[model samples]
Target: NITEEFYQSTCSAVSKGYLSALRTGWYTSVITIELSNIKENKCNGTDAKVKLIKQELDKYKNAVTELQLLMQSTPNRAFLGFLLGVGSAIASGVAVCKVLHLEGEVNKIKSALLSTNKAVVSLSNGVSVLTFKVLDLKNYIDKQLLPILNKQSCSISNIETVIEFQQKNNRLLEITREFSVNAGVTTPVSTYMLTNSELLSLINDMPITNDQKKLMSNNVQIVRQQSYSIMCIIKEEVLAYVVQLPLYGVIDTPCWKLHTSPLCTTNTKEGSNICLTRTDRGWYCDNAGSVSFFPQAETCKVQSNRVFCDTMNSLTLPSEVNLCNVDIFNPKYDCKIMTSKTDVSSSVITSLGAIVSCYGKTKCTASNKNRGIIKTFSNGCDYVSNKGVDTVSVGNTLYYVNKQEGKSLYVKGEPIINFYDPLVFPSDEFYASISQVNEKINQSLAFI
Candidate 1:
């Protein structure tokens, strides 16, 4: 009341000292209000609330102690540094002070503000000595003050207009109404345009064609020439606001999901044609435009049309190179294999009708069909046996010795399954299993 009386009446009568009003105990109202933003209703004695209150108590108490020492002598810039103890949002003109819970040491610091000065403001109001620090009032005269906190001149203590005081009242009321009636939640006034990774999460879940999805999914730069993006606007509570999601979908409004999307990409094309790879650490390319060339395998010639990451060293037949063929174990291929198509639109290779073909002298089903399964399992596979979901274990294998001269083997089903799940894979899930044509011989040489 004393600082309020000083700020509301006496300070204005002194020099309309807005700086003094801000520096004095009124600032405690801002701190207390911010702390009150937590769901803990006024130290109501809820245990979880109690613990939260204590944590904030420790933080604000330290802020108060540091502030007291600062007031003995400090800079206007120092005021913002002190506010950072609560949140950096307040350090700027914006209000991050919407922090929640506990009426902090406002009264402690407000009482702390009721110190005496050699000068007096009024006598009839039974007020003597200053309600605000004389140093605080004068410091603003030559220093920078927060624009949000100051609308009028700080040099004079009596210059605060009636309109100025209304903004203060209105903001407090807005703060009060948001928390008081809205129940436990407090909304923030912020917005973000999610980046490609975050955007993919929204897109990946939507029902779009698989071809378009992967084209958009694999590279951050890949976008359709027409209708290339989706905008998500996290609406505020009974308030806030974007629109036009690509797949005509909507996230829960007053979103439970909040993210900060970074705007990344140089608008210029100087010495760069690409948006440096995700692993780039501020390094720039010298003279070439960023382009997606074919993936050059270590020993394979790079081509623009297809990605070849395997060696054709031993296989001299061009027809057998990068050959997406059935496992040579079954010996009957040609039908389910892809020879040179770079991109497979669907998640799997050409439709494999579970061809039950086999090799060896005489065609026969083996006893152990479980042995040759190229199944996909969930993570944490070892803790429990048979714990995974994707089971390609439907084939059998057996061997026969052809009377004295040679041997024969039999393997069933399409021995190789080049398949992927659209939603299951992380968009770029190309991995090896089922022993490659190169790997089969490498192990043999090692054993020899």
Candidate 2:
């Protein structure tokens, strides 16, 4: 019954506002324009009554706001006054003669309510159209903008990984090479500290995707190039130093005061039986005469020398384990080969102050390959002490170092081949070979 009476009773709040504004304007306009027309119509009593009805409507025009203002001042009496005045005036004007027939006045009230109801319906239809347009705009953004942004973020992440990988490997390789050349060792050697199973497990568990794998591969190529370039510079410097030594004077062994004999140093007192005499058979040795067999040649052999670029092919002439074949992602097998002059430690301290200068203020791991000093025996070799480990001292500067290959394993969780030598060697020949291999590797990466 309330819905049939007025549109505001049934319409939503927003529609009610729209309908109130529309009805107020329409009724006010109709009453004003028809007031004069009703007076001019000569229908006698009925027409004249209509003229008075139009005047009553005009007095209460813009009722929505006008009634609200009145209610605020006289709330209890406002609505009753408005309804009684408007209803009585319209009923009296529309009633025919003194018979007081009210059918026509009722029809006029129904017509006003129905007109405002149509306006509310129209307002709701307009809002539905606007909602559909907004939904379409949201869909367009999801379909077109999101994927492009994600692709850009992925590219940046890939580049950052590559730069970091290269920098770390470069510093480690520089120290390894310097030690190798100074110690007068020929074949490159890597000392492993991890058990075989630990090494294998880490290799298998590395979180390397094909794309990341290719990034690591590119990093290896760059290291190889830098290695050869640095090596050539070292060889030339070493050649000059080689000229400085007396002709065939046995350069490194004399300065360090290491034994030249091929036999291992023996420690035998009066009653103690000499169970075994020491030998430089393996790459690493303990103070107790026990040796850790690092695959290395007893005497420097030219054929055992290796030049690697994209891959590490051989180790001690035994190809069962290609050095490069180890997982690049694993800490145990992933490392670079470095060669250095026997006296390079002194130069390192001179140029940078100490190992801390190059590797930050940190105690680095080092091992002595001072020709035949056999870190294997603690009694005679000052470099190898009873403590089994001592830092290299140059003019009061001490540098920490570990047995060659162990440094890489400790830092990177991978086995690295460190070539400690009497002098640096030329790298142009090795780099040329490395360059050829890298060319193919780079091409494959591009395809991916």
Candidate 3:
């Protein structure tokens, strides 16, 4: 099977193939290096240009100041000279004409200098704006783009190195095969060949050896572990950072709670909630002066430090009576009231989740109550079974209260309201969270 032509072609092709692989790897590495260099150069140039521009602007400012001072001195001097010239011209009769002409020339030069100075100031302002824009761009490139590129380069280099090692392993296997042919011996490839064959077989059929099966299982487990670790790093370092950030068009909920306080009654009708009808009679109904009204007596529970409210009446309170010792069972309710003026925007309610309560079935309405209380509830049964329209009752029949605008109030004390106490991701385990973070990292890791 071995022929002269075959040997020649194999030798030539193998060398060429290896060389090509090497060249490709080298080329990629070089390109990354060059890109990194270019980025550095660009950043440096921009910084230098900014510095120079700033220096030039300072010079211009100083020049303008000097010119202003000079102009001020010139005016006083010119006025003094003009008065002297006027008296002299009148006394010298015909000579007065020449003196007046000289004064006119002096005035013309001063006006021209002033106009020139203004033009210089305008030019300096334009330059300053241009420099600012360039600096801003440079800062972005250095702070964001450069670091990303460096990371990409490192990742690519790592992968390439791994590929190179695999190639070397292949070469070693080839050399062993060649020695087997030359030395007239059966090579010691059984372990490797068997392993490879077993791997293939495991993919298609059943396991042959306990050791082999265990090895395969262990390999799979290791891969999974590595994948999970990568995911965790990505989530902790990248996804969490971006998700919690305030970038536009990134969050699922468009609006954010900025503030929270007692609802004022002044504009109860303006952005105030409406009363739930008899059909919707419940604890919420007792306090429902308008549809926008959430009947804080049932929906909101105020402690000394922790406040809990929900739209569906899912709030809860502890048996303790101390305001400072109470806790807000649910922090996902939107129960803020709009003041008397419908046109004026009301203060946002914090600790409430992303539910918009002022739309659709719960449109704002005018109500008589100025202040309403906030409470916690466990179920909708208490609200549906009893209570009159626009009335709220707490704990079966313990506290029945009427809703008043501004007058009704709730406050949280001692304990801090844990804003991020609830779990949001897939699983409670760190590894499970890692998987979610991996997905997010991949989405954001784009080259372009």
Candidate 4:
């Protein structure tokens, strides 16, 4: 079934295939040598040198692939037989060097094979060293560099925490400043640092009202006003002088008995009776002719009206009749009396006597009598008798005695009377004025 030309063509194809397989083996050897040289040069695992080595390996792989494809497609027994025969001859001459040409070719092949084996061993050792280097780098990163980086991160975190705490503290300070402003405090002192009881005491010292505290902070004028008003009240009410006397004191006696002594007829001059009489003007006369109009009696008498006449003779005893001069009437030297010129002196005496008599037994002395009259005038009395209305005025202020009450002083139509301790002077006007001033200060404190 086989033809001669077909056999010839098959043999040609087989021969070509044998030559191509030898060339591929030579290419593989060259590639192995190149890899060994790259390792020997110690490329240090650089990407560029490794890429060059990979390219050589790829060329070798391509060559092996092409040879495998050629072998599969050829399917020629003659090519295989020729390859076996050449391999057997080379193997047989490997030990013996009898044929010169054969020995020379065997030496060359042995040298190339030895070089290829050495390159393979060198490449394997290089790979092991590269693996150890990689592991060393991993250990250095994990043990040294990684820990340093972690510590740096921890420090950064700590810094951030500190910054956050500072920010919170600053905020608290700002809140404290705001609280001071709102509480009407001027300075931001350290109140929080105080002990519990100290802080409580400070809180107690705070004002009860905001407005009052504001007034206290701004000026304290209201406080000054209140203090002044209180002082005025104390001066006018508590510190004012008031006189007090017993009910059955010297004031209870008759004026004539307390102030005058008896008169003697033997001591009297001619045309003068031993008369003890006081004029309407408050003058006492013992033997004067003008005594006919004596104020103590409706008609003058020498001895019949002894009780009515303020005569020194009334004080005389019959067994030892004696004459002694005594003060009969005390003028109100401290008072001012306004009346018509025709009877001004008598009017003054009458007016002053009426005022002084209100002091009871204290009116015996001239000084005390004047004091009583001035007191009556200052207290505002309305003295009304059958004669006419009598008034005492002092310091441009008028006083009147009321029928229902003792006396009243007026300021702006308001009757100022001291209900309690009525004998005290200055009346209730000073107290009321102080009360008003205090009320105004309270209002100011509330408003501020």
Candidate 5:
């Protein structure tokens, strides 16, 4: 019955013996150098085996620790312990042979040690194969699997970006469709036309499908056609009522005919030559030849070719005349009276009286009193003195006057005062002349 200590010692002894045999080049039998150490008494055979085993065992233990660190996994410790046990068994056998001093037993222990050495060599070769496989696995991951995984990560990021872009495009298309509806354009296309800015943005930055682009192109033409149709309808409706009056033709009214001239004529005989020319004092003349003289009255005196008939006349007078106070004495009259009373030359008195009498009766006396005759003068004196020149024509005669003298007093023509022929009855010739004049007046008035 081996105790736990005995198994421990045996395990230790086996480990040492196998390690020592490796150094000494001993597998089937002990080497010469190991045997020489025993013969020279440097160490006993058992002691030497134990020391060599411990040295080799320390190296093996360190190698296993390194393998554990590299692989990050536990090594085959039980198998290593079993290999150590084989070595211990071999060492124990060698120790036993030396103690018993028996050749048979020594030979038996050598055979056992050789067998254990073979086992240890096989185990080392197996450990080398396992280590090579682990390194191959690490290299394969670095060369192939890791790069593949990184490439997959990049592909995932690219797919996400494409997805986001497509989402934005969908939203833009939706907004454009709504805009088209509000613009009163109806089209069957799924996508609507783009505005200039929208088209530019789509081409420069946005991603869109080919189908959407084609739809937009077609819709642009459709919307343009619709707009053109609307404009055509508007033009047709507007032109339906448009007046197309002739550029040069008869108008409805004679006034329009007189004023519009070449643009409009009238049915009357004089309408072709008639034009309503403007004049001062709100006058219009149908004859263009005589229309030039209406502004200049001074030039009318020598213009004696055909006497202008007084088609119309007006006399302007002051609305009120102020009378001098009748209580005041006329200074000229008083001088005349004083001269008559003081001078014996009665002829001088007569001369003064004559001068005073020229002022008229209304101006000569004021009132009878001790203050003598109260004289009053008419306020029309200044009007009579400064009355401007005026001229009028009637038939073959022209009347000219300086209105300061008296009412309608002619200056150039003599007045036919108090001389009148007997009234004649209306004759056919007179009636005919009056009708002709009336016709002339009517024609002139029609031009207005």
Candidate 6:
């Protein structure tokens, strides 16, 4: 509740007329006017909408303090509308003149409310993201902290848990690191952790025989070391998330400008992706070696239309990671390379939807594939088309040019392009004539 108490306590002396409007009669009239429209306006109608609003209103302990919470409870726009619409109605029930300072009072209310709500919502959003991972971290904390209390055994296998602990907890760690630091939570997240001396005392305090004690104490040390490392891992991952993005897209924007830009002073790229791997202390860009690698003294964050580098060696980013349009089947080039842009066979395998030996005049593109092949079988079968309805065969059954239907469904000439036509490039849909296809290709090339 950003109430009269909240506002008045924050600062003082909001003119006498505005304070007088807080009487039961005036408050009742203004809130009632807004409530009548809330069913229509607020939350756009659910059965519980009014109930939730009422419940939130009830939680206002400053309901006693009676002030801006009612006004601020509304969306700023709707609250503005509420002010305009309710002014005349408020005047009739209260006093026409008393409402003059109402506008001034609202501005004061807004000034107080702005700073609080912005920081509150920002941190709230950040914490809400953490709720998903908080339990997992808690599970980790449970294993480490309660070794004596819960009698939880710390085995070598628990080291695996600490290592794998960070694989989830993404998105939030960045938010937690950023907003919480501003909110004064600070970094490392390990300040509450047991010190080395504290752990020594703890292990000494545990009452167990020598055989049990030796391994148990050793495992406890492992737990503390591994746990502190895990806490540090949180910072590492936050840094990764901070800089993680598709650098290829940014780097694609002409290479020289990217290196020329002083902002891109770092060569080490950081991110938690299959494309990036941990190298030494930071993430190594495990990109296909087609990109220009620049070396600089600072961290490279490839964002905006900007590119980056840390050291000075030039390379090119492969077009596969660029995710452009390339006909994986017929790349208009030699058969040796899968796509015209990439020799990467994994990319070739990923693009397979259909494998056809019979070649045609390059273009049969449509929203739907002509899945109605030559025939169907009990287990599986071959299938067909819609362009002049031409086909050569299936198994031993020779399927010819299919006409309208069965009896009259005799066919015509051979396939449009020969099956063994080695000269033909990959299939691409072209319209009308040669120049039109040329126009479309050039247009597409410009955009690409």
Off by over 4 Å in 4: 1-155, 158-172, 179-448
Candidate 1 — which residues are off by over 4 angstroms? 1-30, 33-106, 113-162, 189-416, 419-448
**Per-prediction CA RMSD (Å):** 29.0, 43.1, 37.7, 63.6, 62.8, 31.5
Off by over 4 Å in 2: 1-213, 217-263, 266-377, 380-390, 393-399, 402-448
Backbone clash total, candidate 6: 22
Candidate 1: tens digits of C-alpha lDDT, residues 1-448: 0010001100000001011000000011111211111121233333443343244334433433332333233111210112111222122111111111114322322343445321223222222212222122212221322221233422222224323333323333343333333231222221122234434554464445565455435532212111111111111111110111222111111100000011111214322211101110010111112211112112222122122111111111222211212223233222111111112111110011111111112222212245543332121100001122122221233222111111111112321222222222222212222233234335555664
Which candidate achieves the best lDDT against the true structure? Answer: 6
lDDT of 2 by residue, 250-367 (tens): 1111000001111111224312211111111112111122211222222211111111111111122222112222332233332222111111112121111112111112222333
Model 3 scores what on Cα lDDT? 0.21
Q: Candidate 4: worst 10 consecutive residues by lDDT? A: 13-22
- List candidate 3 stretches off by more than 4 Å: 1-258, 261-352, 359-448
Q: What is candidate 6's CA lDDT for residue 401? A: 39
Give lDDT per model, in order: 0.22, 0.20, 0.21, 0.21, 0.20, 0.22
Please give me the total number of clashing residue pairs in predicted model 1.
17
Regions of candidate 5 where Cα sits further than 4 Å from its true position: 1-235, 239-420, 423-448
Error of 6 at 380 (Å): 22
The TM-score, computed over Cα atoms with residue i paired to residue i, of candidate 5 is: 0.11
Count of clashing residue pairs in every prediction: 17, 31, 43, 12, 8, 22
